[PDB]
Design a protein around this ligand. Structure first.
Ligand SMILES: [Mg+2]
Ligand SMILES: [Mg+2]
Ligand SMILES: [Mg+2]
Ligand SMILES: [Mg+2]
Ligand SMILES: [Mg+2]
Ligand SMILES: [Mg+2]
Ligand SMILES: [Mg+2]
Ligand SMILES: [Mg+2]
Ligand SMILES: [Mg+2]
Ligand SMILES: [Mg+2]
Ligand SMILES: [Mg+2]
Ligand SMILES: [Mg+2]
Ligand SMILES: [Mg+2]
Ligand SMILES: [Mg+2]
Ligand SMILES: [Mg+2]
Ligand SMILES: [Mg+2]
Ligand SMILES: [Mg+2]
Ligand SMILES: [Mg+2]
Ligand SMILES: [Mg+2]
Ligand SMILES: [Mg+2]
Ligand SMILES: [Mg+2]
Ligand SMILES: [Mg+2]
Ligand SMILES: [Mg+2]
Ligand SMILES: [Mg+2]
Ligand SMILES: [Mg+2]
Ligand SMILES: [Mg+2]
Ligand SMILES: [Mg+2]
Ligand SMILES: [Mg+2]
Ligand SMILES: [Mg+2]
Ligand SMILES: [Mg+2]
Ligand SMILES: [Mg+2]
Ligand SMILES: [Mg+2]
Ligand SMILES: [Mg+2]
Ligand SMILES: [Mg+2]
Ligand SMILES: [Mg+2]
Ligand SMILES: [Mg+2]
Ligand SMILES: [Mg+2]
Ligand SMILES: [Mg+2]
Ligand SMILES: [Mg+2]
Ligand SMILES: [Mg+2]
Ligand SMILES: [Mg+2]
Ligand SMILES: [Mg+2]
Ligand SMILES: [Mg+2]
Ligand SMILES: [Mg+2]
Ligand SMILES: [Mg+2]
Ligand SMILES: [Mg+2]
Ligand SMILES: [Mg+2]
Ligand SMILES: [Mg+2]
Lengths: 185, 339, 134
RNA sequence: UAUCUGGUUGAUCCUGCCAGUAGUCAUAUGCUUGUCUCAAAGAUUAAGCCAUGCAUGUCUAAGUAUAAGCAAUUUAUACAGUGAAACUGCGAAUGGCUCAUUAAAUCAGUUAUCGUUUAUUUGAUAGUUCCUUUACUACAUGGUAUAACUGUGGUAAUUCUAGA
RNA sequence: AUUCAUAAUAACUUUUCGAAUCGCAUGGCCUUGUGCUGGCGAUGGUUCAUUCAAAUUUCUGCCCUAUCAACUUUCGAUGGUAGGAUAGUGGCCUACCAUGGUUUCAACGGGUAACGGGGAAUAAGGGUUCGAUUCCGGAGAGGGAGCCUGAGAAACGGCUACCACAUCCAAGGAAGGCAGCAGGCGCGCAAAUUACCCAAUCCUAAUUCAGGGAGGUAGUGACAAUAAAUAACGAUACAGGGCCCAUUCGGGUCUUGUAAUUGGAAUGAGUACAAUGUAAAUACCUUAACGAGGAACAAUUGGAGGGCAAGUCUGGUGCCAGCAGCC
């Protein structure tokens, strides 16, 4: 006698188990963006899949139908916000177009590298998970963060860690200790 | 933590798969002056020492050592024939012990093996003998000191005791002892002390007790004080309904708590249990109805208790029972179990 | 010891419970988390009240570090706190003793034993006193 | 979010089904198992059986205090603080659990009471009661019987209770 | 819409209600009786309304089944009249009377490993399958029946009987219903602690206070579900692939990386002052002191002829052992 905590899942898996072309494609994606799971692609194809459905749905409605307008516009401005939808093609048949890379290109994982700051999607990961880098003063440690566009200007290393001042942190400090303890007194 | 209380098991005898004697000590107490149904363990028997004070009448002067001893705590196992399961029964059974013998033979088939096992362990024991009333002409006065009664029974009877007594001594000597009657006794670690004891009707039974505490004082003094961690042995495995399946265990030292985690021995590995309940003792008197054990929150050791635990299935005789400090323990039980 | 700064957002003057109640926004760059005693001391001196009439709680430090949001109350007198406050809080502070009792089930057990007796009971003691005889 | 593939022949096109493939708030089992959050769980078989413990009790200034209770003090010689026991009142018909029965039953949506009961909550609502009707009828207030208690008892034994 | 609400006449009644109650204050007013008055509010009380209910009740809607075709009136089946009974309508029951009621538009009977619904799973659409189980309704408390109390129960942590189980005894008797919470046996492929608290959510009482295995807390827990560590970065040894030039050594600048020496960096898994958390604890979020080089702090589970993604490597076996959903 409490309330259901509701949940749901965030991915869907391929109907065809072994399709060489699809495996190459997937891998290349995972390789460009530095993912670890075929699931990190599955998830995005799933997000996309829903988005596309909703899109089609509104699209069979009449032009200037209240629902299509309210929800369609909302869907769009929501997509423009993250930077998945180019401002030119801000009218839902390009959202019906779209495609997965347009989503991938916007993870924090990737933005951290794209404006230099990492020079490898992997160094990008390892950076992000290891706490350094943030959006405000707000440390983010999630490669899938999805950089919000008007916070693109705000991706820098954190007030903590090195890389944004504050310390070198035990390993370098361990070594500073080795210098002033071996060489001196 | 504790002052240890004495742990004495009574060994030997045949066709008295329980020897009547301790059983008499409870019976003497119950219908003569009591307050209610009396707490009696299982697989071990406990008595407050204040039971003993009531059950004993002074010789005139022979038992009143009562300074810092809180009473036994008597354990029991003989019954088979086999010959035997009785042996070992943990390194606590062992400890001090009473060996009884026939007043007609002084020997029994297994009593060779039994005494022999005791000698190997080289732990003290006190010779006693049960019943003296499967003996021509006798007369009884219940729970009366030996000495009083002995003098009262006629000459033929007296001599007959002496005659039998030399026989008993003789056989005992060849088996490898030197011994004499307890009151007559010259030095405890000189000669083993013999208390004639009647188990049908009381005759000298308190005096048997006088000697036990006396011997306890002699060997064990600095020996009794302990600090220790909870040290016990699992004796016997059986089922119960109300709060489920159990093991009956004897706790020699420690303080035992309800919530405790204990590691215990399996055989397909080391096993651990949460004690669900601490069961044992039980009071007394119940025709076909009411409660049958009493629950306890905590326990001071030198008690034999039944532990109820929710994963307790398999166990063995000879395993240790110990309270948890997991890792060292985990290997310790596992090596030991292989035997 | 890197300055800190104690903000108090969303404030309500609540006279029907004799206190001003508010959120507490604690910045603390270079100094992890603050403490409750420091906070009651510090706001004792903004509301001209004193420590033992300020209550503070809630509280979690923001993910990643350097900020903690909580909640505070300051009473229009130490009496008003000692009466409107949760007693565990008064315990937390130093303004009330934790009078500890028997376990919950120890107590229930006591009560259930007490059910089986009708009346005073010392009467029943003198009645068992004769069961001691016969 | 409208996909199919392997297997009948020498080869071929079909019919066909077997097998592959993917999901399951769908259970079991096996192997493996580091971190955060969330957290179902003796339904399926046996509405089979159950040791022990707990799960229903309750007092405001405001029904009843000669506790031979406590407190004492601060005015109370009827009572007055506090308060066990007991009387009285209220509650125990809610909750929790399970899914055995049950197939026009229940249940759902929809109706009916001009076909009835309703503690309680809330709002209202009571000048009449006696009697051949001047020698009046306690109203400045009519009756006893009981607990707890005191004391005497019974039974191996229960929340058993008897006589005074 | 009424023989409605309401009222009037004549009577009726082992006569219902009309305050013999409690707490706080103590004040007015004289013909000075302790006179006659008199403040705030408690618990009651009859009838009406209201609220919380309840009980019946209209219309339509259920799975398989004809190897179930006729069913219903023994002993009410369908209707009429009157009564009795009920809180009250009604064959609810009883008297008397009649011969009705349902059915291929599937009655009646059988089955159900059937509680109903909100819902769940599966995604072209149409469907198919499931719903013991967090909310609603219903039913039950081992099986049947009966009933006391009461506003309300045909109650089971109430009684009474019988049936089946079953406990204690001093053998005369007495006592019990976990489909509440834990816990145990049994069953089985199949399912956790005999822990802590009323701090929240709310419920009950005479009631701010007591009680609450309701409910909350922790333990057990790879049921589902979410996020996502097991590594990141330079230098060096050649090797390249580049590229300009090539009359030819070539390397060198930009790097792709395969390396049996290297180099300093980073971090939480853990461990742990502290404070935070909490009813108190525990964990999480914080965070001093610790905590990574291959011997870890060391990922798994299946597969590699086809379907189906990945060997025609080496050794073994020799229609054996074994594999193979299918071929
Ligand atoms: Mg840090
Ligand atoms: Mg309590
Ligand atoms: Mg009471
Ligand atoms: Mg074919
Ligand atoms: Mg074939
Ligand atoms: Mg053919
Ligand atoms: Mg062929
Ligand atoms: Mg051919
Ligand atoms: Mg196949
Ligand atoms: Mg198939
Ligand atoms: Mg690991
Ligand atoms: Mg989380
Ligand atoms: Mg079970
Ligand atoms: Mg269930
Ligand atoms: Mg069941
Ligand atoms: Mg008084
Ligand atoms: Mg009452
Ligand atoms: Mg009378
Ligand atoms: Mg006056
Ligand atoms: Mg009223
Ligand atoms: Mg009729
Ligand atoms: Mg009727
Ligand atoms: Mg007919
Ligand atoms: Mg007909
Ligand atoms: Mg049909
Ligand atoms: Mg069923
Ligand atoms: Mg259901
Ligand atoms: Mg169904
Ligand atoms: Mg079922
Ligand atoms: Mg209804
Ligand atoms: Mg049952
Ligand atoms: Mg019933
Ligand atoms: Mg029950
Ligand atoms: Mg009930
Ligand atoms: Mg029957
Ligand atoms: Mg008798
Ligand atoms: Mg249960
Ligand atoms: Mg309960
Ligand atoms: Mg399971
Ligand atoms: Mg269980
Ligand atoms: Mg509460
Ligand atoms: Mg609980
Ligand atoms: Mg519960
Ligand atoms: Mg756990
Ligand atoms: Mg480290
Ligand atoms: Mg390492
Ligand atoms: Mg492998
Ligand atoms: Mg292939």
């Amino acid at each position: 006698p409490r309330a259901p905590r509701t949940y749901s899942k965030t991915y869907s898996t391929p109907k065809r188990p072994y399709e060489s072309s699809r495996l190459d494609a997937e891998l290349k994606l995972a390789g460009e963006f530095g993912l670890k799971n075929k699931k990190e692609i599955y998830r995005i194809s799933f997000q996309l899949s829903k988005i596309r459905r909703a899109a089609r749905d509104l699209l069979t409605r009449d032009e200037k139908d209240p629902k299509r307008l309210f929800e369609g516009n909302a869907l769009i401005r929501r997509l423009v916000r993250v930077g998945v939808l180019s401002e030119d093609k801000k009218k839902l048949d390009y959202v019906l177009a779209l495609k997965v890379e347009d989503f991938l290109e916007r993870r924090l994982q990737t933005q951290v590298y794209k404006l230099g700051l990492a020079k490898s999607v992997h160094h990008a990961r390892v950076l992000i998970t290891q706490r350094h880098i943030a959006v405000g003063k707000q440390i983010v440690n999630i490669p899938s963060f999805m950089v919000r566009l008007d916070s693109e200007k705000h991706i820098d290393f954190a007030p903590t860690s090195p890389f944004g001042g504050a310390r070198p942190g035990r390993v370098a400090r361990r070594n500073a200790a080795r210098k002033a303890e071996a060489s001196g007194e | 933590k504790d002052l240890r209380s004495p742990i004495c098991c009574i060994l030997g005898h045949v066709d008295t798969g329980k020897t009547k004697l301790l059983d008499k000590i409870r019976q003497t107490n119950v219908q003569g002056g009591e307050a209610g149904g009396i707490t009696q363990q299982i697989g071990a028997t406990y008595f407050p020492i204040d039971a003993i004070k009531a059950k004993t009448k002074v010789m005139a002067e022979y038992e009143k050592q009562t300074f810092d001893v809180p009473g036994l705590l008597v354990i029991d196992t003989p019954g088979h024939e086999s010959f035997s399961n009785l042996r070992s029964r943990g390194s606590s059974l062992c400890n001090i012990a009473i060996l009884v013998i026939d007043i007609m033979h002084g020997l029994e088939q297994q009593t060779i093996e039994s005494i022999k096992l005791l000698r190997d362990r080289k732990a003290p024991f006190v010779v006693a003998l049960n019943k003296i009333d499967r003996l021509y002409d006798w007369k009884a006065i219940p729970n009366n000191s030996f000495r009083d009664s002995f003098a009262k029974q006629s000459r033929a009877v007296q001599e007959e005791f002496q005659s039998r007594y030399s026989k008993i001594q003789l056989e005992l000597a060849e088996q490898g002892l030197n011994s004499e009657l307890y009151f007559q006794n010259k030095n405890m670690s000189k000669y083993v002390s013999i208390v004639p004891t009647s188990a049908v009707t009381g005759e000298g039974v308190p005096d048997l007790l006088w000697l036990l505490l006396e011997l306890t004082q002699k060997r064990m003094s600095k020996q009794l004080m302990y600090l220790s961690h909870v040290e016990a042995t699992i004796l016997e495995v059986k089922v119960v309904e109300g709060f489920g399946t159990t093991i009956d265990v004897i706790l020699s030292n420690g303080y035992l708590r309800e919530g405790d985690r204990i590691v215990l021995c399996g055989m397909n590995g080391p096993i651990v249990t949460n004690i669900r309940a601490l069961l044992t003792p039980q009071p007394l008197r119940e025709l076909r109805l009411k409660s049958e054990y009493v629950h306890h929150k905590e326990v001071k050791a030198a008690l034999g208790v039944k532990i109820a635990a929710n994963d307790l299935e398999k166990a063995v005789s000879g395993s240790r029972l110990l309270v948890v400090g997991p890792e060292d323990d985990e290997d310790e039980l596992m090596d030991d179990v292989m035997d | 010891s890197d300055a800190v700064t104690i903000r108090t957002r969303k404030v309500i003057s609540n006279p029907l419970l004799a206190r001003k109640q508010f959120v507490v926004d604690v910045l603390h760059p270079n100094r992890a988390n603050v403490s409750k005693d420091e906070l009651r001391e510090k706001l004792a001196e903004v509301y001209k009240a004193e420590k033992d009439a300020v209550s503070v709680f809630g509280f979690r430090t923001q993910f990643g570090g350097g900020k903690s949001v909580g909640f505070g109350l300051v009473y229009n007198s130490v009496a008003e706190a000692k009466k409107f406050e949760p007693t565990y809080r008064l315990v937390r502070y130093g303004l009330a003793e934790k009078v500890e009792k028997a376990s919950r089930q120890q107590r229930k057990q006591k009560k259930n034993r007490d059910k089986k007796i009708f009346g005073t009971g010392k009467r029943l003691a003198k009645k068992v006193a004769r069961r001691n005889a016969d």
